[PDB]
Design a protein around this ligand. Structure first.
Ligand SMILES: C[S@@+](CC[C@H](N)C(=O)[O-])C[C@H]1O[C@@H](n2cnc3c(N)ncnc32)[C@H](O)[C@@H]1O
Ligand SMILES: Nc1ncnc2c1ncn2[C@@H]1O[C@H](COP(=O)(O)OP(=O)(O)O)[C@@H](O)[C@H]1O
Ligand SMILES: [Cl-]
Length: 450
């Protein structure tokens, strides 16, 4: 009998599924977490086009497991307490149509034994802190990595050090330390535990999918830096995910260890905001990539775009790949000239901001640096020369002749329309080497070093 099994529970942690007579006795009501978990289940189930296989780690009295089984899920629940599992099985029997299995077992062992594809979704609510306490942070990070590796998605409610209990002292400084090694993560809620005033964050984590309420898709690889050789400029607060026809930029506004300034957060916020603005409203006759999704919240913001073919110029340069400098410069200058005519300029023309397709046509890929108003744009023309030089001191005829021509122009005349015009006629232009010159060359060379 259920009554006896319930009585022999060391603790009625959760609501007893289907038995409201014990609702008052339950430490946690579970309705709030359930509402959120069911929402995420639905999202993922919709995306994959079917009911899910779900793994419930430290399943206690089976509330979440049974609740999901109720909606059609196939579930396996694990708990290391025999009493808990006995209740779960009993409840399952009262609901014979539910596809629900329960096993007495250790989370550590089950995770080690998992195979990829076995489960779509794993839930681990207020359990991993126990594992941290006995086995340390590094082992837990590995467990969670593997869990992520073998599933599509993972939901965790994580206990925190601020909680007033003795075990809090073993906890990481920040719960994100347990998951940040995983590819994708988002805060999805915060819950009152009724143990104390300190709430527990609930995180949605994945090593295989971008999981955004509006956009739920696999990705094939991701990176923590914008390009090969970026170093640590953004202090790792930015992540990039690449899928079949999309790129997802995910910016953290909030980082652990307080590492993001105020200024840096705001710049993350500003760049993303700025990028969305431009892409949603681009100028006529400018092939700009398309916006598939976007959003912001307190912790972070994101943008999903159409993917554009090709390789990043800076990589190609570094990896000594063969390039057509004429086609690259021509295509790029053409786009800059056209932007300018529409009263747009790009503040940051660099190799890491240029993408080159298989036909050696080049385009800009970072629209964070796009601007509308300012003498000007004389500075931008100047940097473009550096760009040119780095793309190759280094300029053969007629590129040198081109630059020399521009340098002979009064500064009021300098803009991208001019730069392009002269570029197009560069073979006709006088020879730089035949003139005193010689300074245009030395200035940029120093600039380009600088
Ligand atoms: C505090 S409760 C949380 C219960 C449930 N996940 C929830 O939040 O509603 C922790 C549960 O995990 C179980 N547990 C703790 N450590 C475990 C481990 N290493 N392996 C399996 N179960 C564990 C306990 O028996 C208990 O049922
Ligand atoms: N539309 C896109 N298609 C393909 N790759 C992209 C696209 N947008 C960005 N990237 C990639 O993102 C990386 C950094 O993107 P970027 O636009 O520089 O973001 P940020 O500079 O704000 O970090 C680039 O190295 C590039 O590989
Ligand atoms: Cl936890």
């Amino acid at each position: 009998d259920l009554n006896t099994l319930v009585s022999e529970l060391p603790e009625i942690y959760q609501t007893i599924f289907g038995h409201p007579e014990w609702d008052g006795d339950a430490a946690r009501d579970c309705n709030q977490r359930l509402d959120l978990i069911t929402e995420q289940y639905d999202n993922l189930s919709r995306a994959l086009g079917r009911p899910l296989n779900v793994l419930d780690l430290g399943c206690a009295q089976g509330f979440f497991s049974l609740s999901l089984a109720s909606k059609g899920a196939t579930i396996v629940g694990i708990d290391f307490q025999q009493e808990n599992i006995n209740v779960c099985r009993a409840l399952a029997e009262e609901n014979p149509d539910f596809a629900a299995e329960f096993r007495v077992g250790r989370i550590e062992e089950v995770i080690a034994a998992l195979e990829e594809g076995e489960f779509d979704l794993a839930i681990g609510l207020s359990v991993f802190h126990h594992i941290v306490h006995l086995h340390g942070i590094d082992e837990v990070k590995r467990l969670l990595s593997r869990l992520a590796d073998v599933t599509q998605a993972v939901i965790l409610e994580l206990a925190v050090k601020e909680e007033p209990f003795y075990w809090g002292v073993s906890q990481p400084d920040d719960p994100r330390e347990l998951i940040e090694q995983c590819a994708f993560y988002r805060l999805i809620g915060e819950f009152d535990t009724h143990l104390s005033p300190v709430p527990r964050p609930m995180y949605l984590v994945s090593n295989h999918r971008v999981l955004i309420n509006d956009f739920n898709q696999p990705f094939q690889h991701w990176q923590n830096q914008p390009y090969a050789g970026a170093g640590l400029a953004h202090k790792r607060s930015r992540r990039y995910f690449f899928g079949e026809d999309y790129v997802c930029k995910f910016f953290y506004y909030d980082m652990p260890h307080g590492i993001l300034t105020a200024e840096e957060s705001q710049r993350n916020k500003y760049e993303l905001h700025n990028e969305i603005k431009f892409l949603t409203q681009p100028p006529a006759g400018f092939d700009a990539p398309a916006v598939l999704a976007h959003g912001e919240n307190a912790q972070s913001g994101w943008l999903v775009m159409e993917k554009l073919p090709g390789r990043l110029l800076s990589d190609m340069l570094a990896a000594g790949e063969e390039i057509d400098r004429e086609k690259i410069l021509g295509s790029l200058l053409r786009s800059l000239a056209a932007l300018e005519k529409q009263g747009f300029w790009h503040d940051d023309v660099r190799p890491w901001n240029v993408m080159v397709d298989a036909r050696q046509h080049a385009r800009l890929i970072d629209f964070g640096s796009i601007v509308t108003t300012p003498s000007w744009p004389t500075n931008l023309v100047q940097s473009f020369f550096v760009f040119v030089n780095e793309l190759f001191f280094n300029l053969p005829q007629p590129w040198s002749n081109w630059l020399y021509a521009v340098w002979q122009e009064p500064v009021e005349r300098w803009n991208f329309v001019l730069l392009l015009a002269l570029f197009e006629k560069k073979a006709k232009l006088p020879s730089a080497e035949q003139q005193r010159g010689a300074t245009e060359q030395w200035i940029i060379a120093q600039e380009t070093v600088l």
